[PDB]
Design a protein around this ligand. Structure first.
Ligand SMILES: [Cl-]
Ligand SMILES: [Cl-]
Ligand SMILES: [Cl-]
Ligand SMILES: [Cl-]
Ligand SMILES: [Cl-]
Ligand SMILES: [Cl-]
Ligand SMILES: [Cl-]
Ligand SMILES: [Cl-]
Ligand SMILES: [Cl-]
Ligand SMILES: [Cl-]
Ligand SMILES: [Cl-]
Ligand SMILES: [Cl-]
Ligand SMILES: [Cl-]
Ligand SMILES: [Cl-]
Ligand SMILES: [Cl-]
Ligand SMILES: [Cl-]
Ligand SMILES: [Mg+2]
Ligand SMILES: [Mg+2]
Lengths: 351, 348, 351, 348
């Protein structure tokens, strides 16, 4: 080699910084590649979780209908007597043998339900861990991009410093020493930027963690305390506390009795949601316990108060004047409120 | 004579009652027909006013709010000072009077519609009530008419006996009178049974009013079944360590600790919640987890206020770059956002 | 017996008519009982048909996703190479053994799908036959009620005729012979009513069968030929046939190119449904081929033209300016239009 | 001198071009800001007018139609002749003028709103178009500015050489000029590549316009998949012998022979159709089978005309006791009937 001692020192600074630069770039490619495959694992797990979810919900309903039919009490006693309905001279019995198959099919169903609940649970943790890793990697990538900008600026200046030590000229040493001073100033700018980045990142996270010091009630309190605070309910009218405005036994009289917050002159049940909306009440398509269910059939319609909710297509209700019975109470048990002869259902909420 | 007048008096008294019932039947039936028509017309007008009132309310809240949004009003005061620059014929301040005139005209029409619907509601309600009372009166009259017409029959035969002839015939229609009087007693016993039934049925109805919602809801859970799908629920962690700091999932888990621990990207929370046994739906409720699915990562938040399906407030984390938990948007429409299809997960 | 010859003749008429009366009443109870149990069989079959239907639809989607993943072509070649990725010194392989289980699970799925399609088919015919029998019985019950009214009126008169032949009195024979003449007149009235019933029933059915002499086109023609005929589309404006009102490459320009019946000044894609509705176009939530899909995100939104539809949550579309690509064409393949970053989807229909 | 003026001229010419670009950048950016604001305001007003126009159209069709329903107008002519009976101060004919005045006022406001939305649409559309054109011009200017500023640099160094001193220095900044001119050439080649790319991209976009819907739909079916779910469909009977005469099912089967043969009560038709591979949905289309489910027997019909989701006509059998096939209701709302939840089954 024709290398000097001073030139080797400059070469060492270039090789050290280049090593750091390549190390950052290698990790960037490493993390970006890991994220790509983890995002793919997640997508696949997500599709499988969706598949299991609908099956679990569907199978639960089937298992609850099959339980109800197998545990109705009043009709089940006859199903136990059907097995006993065979002893002496009845030709050929295949009722008891067929009873084993429906129980075998039943036991097979809950075992598959148990397996699906196990599988979705396992797929959830793996998916969640994959998603968490990807976010941590993305944060590491953001940190590396700032570090790379700094180290590449340092490398530039170091390479110019090496170019000065090699220079076989008085004219040129001076030229690239001006360029080195310029490059070193740029490297300082990059470092100060990275310092501000770390400074900002740290305080931002502390500000995020500080906001966790709260709860829902305080959060809901802040809405009503603000200017944009629910004041649409202020313009409502004070209604009567009794049902004297509705005739005895009617569905309207019944709902007014159970839900005294309803209006006094809201007419036929069919029009209650229409009048309630005008009065400032919130309406919607999903049942809530305590909400007034309003069915519109283009005629008189019907109203009731929701007493229990399992889904949008499965509720219980307390009502008056259903199928000729004018007493207030539970007339139907569980039923689907979207598929009745009273028509389009809409719910009126208290708040 | 004299005895014949007494018989004639009984016929005329009962005939008077019979005609009175028939007159009232025609009276009530005619009143019901026109009241049912008045109701139908009022119903159509109430529907017309209702949609206008709701629509106009939304319009009135989109207006005024945009011209009185805290932060934005200072610019509206500067607009008059900026339009005052002499270049060169100014009609910006004069045109500002027209939008305020149009605004004031809108709330005055809203106030008139709320007044009109209120008046139409009471008239309609009274009309409906009157019709039902009349129908009950008509049912009572039909039973009374059957009785009085049977009494009239016997009374007319009694008069026919006093006019005599005499045969041969007195004895004949006195047997018919005794038969008619027995029929009249049968009609009376039938009307008594009718009143007996009507009275006890109404008492049974009035007895059922002695209740309230809580007792009603209690009877459902006390019955064989009875919501028992929530019994199989799981114990989730009480902290948000399973979700990364600043993410929307971490924020919702912080505000709604009843949510799951490994429910992944916000988009899939409703899907996992439904599998876990939670109830989901399309209408916002305060305290519900709003889950938006965009076919990607999606988003989650907790509903803090609800005015309608298309107007809510929420508290969330990581919205538009801001990773702190809080209110980021104010009032907004959750169905029309870049995070996609909204679904709500309810606590119970 | 102290029975006369004439009295026996009267007694015979009573016994013959009573036999007919009891025969009708016996059949009424017979048919009413059969209908009750057939209505119950139907209800049970209906619930089972609903159960099978949702499973068949759900399982079809799963089988088509599992087929797609197992028949993607470009990624499947790697799945065939994974089995070949084992020969000499690889420790323990359970990738080929696990491949048998997913195929076993796949083959088990289509066999259960085939069994469910077989079961629903069988349950459909049994249910349909049960429903048909119940309607035929109801028609027979309507016929019997008319016949019963007639025969009971005949019985009344016959019993009075017997009461006249027994009568041991000059005073009473004459009385119940007047009652018999009255009863016979009532019996004639009942017969004439039953004749009118049969007369009406026969001609009504012929009038119903006559109305079947038609088809949809004639039916749709009669609507437009009537006074209540679609004339809301008359007030529309004639739009330009080119997309010069929209800038090159935009989504609006693309939709206008493929659907020239769209408007010229409808602005950002998000507002197209809003302007279309004002212009008199019909809008809705379900995709149709040739409909303009309008997504509203509270911003600029997006528009496209629907090119294929499998369900509400699965369509294909041709569009312009998707994910940076400004050419008109198919960018996404099959996708769910309700779950995208462009927001709330609404469809604008040509008619 | 003289040579220095030539150098000064080159600096002043290029500086003029540089300032012209920068002036236009500020000009276009300012115009876009105010046009984006005009658009936002117009958008809100278009939304306001749209809902009013749709709402008012429904109101106008519920009105007039009720006062001009064939069969019902003869009674409206008799109402003036019946209110003319002298009993005793008549204000029924005078009040009839007010509802017609209110009606005529409604269509005049509808006509004004259709005029206003049309005008607002063109102004908004032109505003949006201008903004996009400006954004493209801004992208072009940024590339041109980079080039002209590089040319200016070299020209200023050329002027600095002619002023000289002279050293020692002429030679120094002539080397810098040669370096600057090389940089200016690099900027020009970059702008050329930009124009090269921009031009070919637009040609590729314009090329894709050479198509139509049919070719587009053809490419879907020609691709790997391609709707092939309809391939597995079944051959049903061509007559309605499987359904009893006069029933709603028999009627729909007669009009829509593509329906199934053993689909039972009308209520379950959508359920069986979905299992059979047919597409279902919540929006009416002409020729679709409407299936109403009331938790009981339900009802079916064939859609013959559609105005909206809440306004259709249908042809059906066995409606309100009438078992003939035909139009029984005219225009009606299929979501608000006593037959329950409506769902439509589509042919394809
Ligand atoms: Cl909390
Ligand atoms: Cl009812
Ligand atoms: Cl009762
Ligand atoms: Cl009860
Ligand atoms: Cl934490
Ligand atoms: Cl974490
Ligand atoms: Cl963490
Ligand atoms: Cl959406
Ligand atoms: Cl046809
Ligand atoms: Cl896009
Ligand atoms: Cl492009
Ligand atoms: Cl493409
Ligand atoms: Cl036939
Ligand atoms: Cl048949
Ligand atoms: Cl037949
Ligand atoms: Cl409904
Ligand atoms: Mg905040
Ligand atoms: Mg007809």
């Amino acid at each position: 080699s024709n290398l000097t001692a001073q030139q080797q020192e400059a070469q060492k600074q270039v090789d050290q910084i280049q090593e750091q630069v390549s190390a950052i770039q290698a990790e960037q490619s490493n993390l970006q590649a890991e994220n790509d495959r983890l995002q793919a694992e997640s997508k696949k797990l997500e599709g499988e979780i969706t598949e299991l979810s609908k099956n679990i919900v569907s199978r639960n309903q089937s298992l609850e209908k099959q339980a109800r039919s197998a545990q109705t009490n009043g009709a089940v006693t006859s199903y136990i007597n059907t097995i006993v309905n065979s002893k002496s001279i009845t030709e050929a019995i295949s009722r008891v043998a067929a009873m084993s198959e429906i129980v075998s099919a039943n036991n097979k169903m809950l075992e598959q339900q148990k397996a699906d609940k196990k599988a979705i649970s396992e797929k959830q943790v793996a998916n969640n861990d994959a998603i968490n890793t990807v976010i941590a990697n993305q944060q590491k990538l953001a940190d590396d991009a700032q570090a790379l900008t700094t180290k590449q600026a340092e490398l530039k200046a170091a390479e110019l410093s090496l170019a000065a030590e090699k220079a076989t000229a008085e004219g040129e040493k001076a030229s690239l020493l001006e360029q080195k001073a310029a490059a070193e100033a740029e490297a300082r700018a990059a470092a100060v930027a990275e310092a501000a980045y770390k400074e900002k990142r740290a305080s931002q996270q502390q500000s995020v963690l500080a906001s966790a010091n709260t709860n829902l009630t305080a959060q809901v309190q802040a809405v009503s305390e603000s200017a944009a605070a629910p004041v649409r309910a202020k313009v409502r009218p004070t209604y009567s506390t009794n049902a004297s405005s509705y005739p005895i036994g009617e569905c309207t009289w019944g709902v007014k009795t159970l839900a005294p917050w309803a209006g006094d002159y809201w007419g036929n049940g069919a029009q209650w949601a229409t009048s309630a909306a005008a009065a400032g009440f919130r309406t919607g398509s999903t049942p809530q316990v305590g909400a007034i269910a309003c069915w519109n059939d283009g005629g008189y319609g019907h109203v009731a108060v929701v007493t229990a909710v399992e889904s949008t297509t499965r509720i219980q209700v307390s009502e008056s004047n259903y199928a000729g019975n004018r007493t207030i109470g539970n007339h139907r048990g569980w039923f689907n409120p979207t598929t009745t002869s009273e028509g389009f259902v809409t719910y009126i909420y208290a708040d």
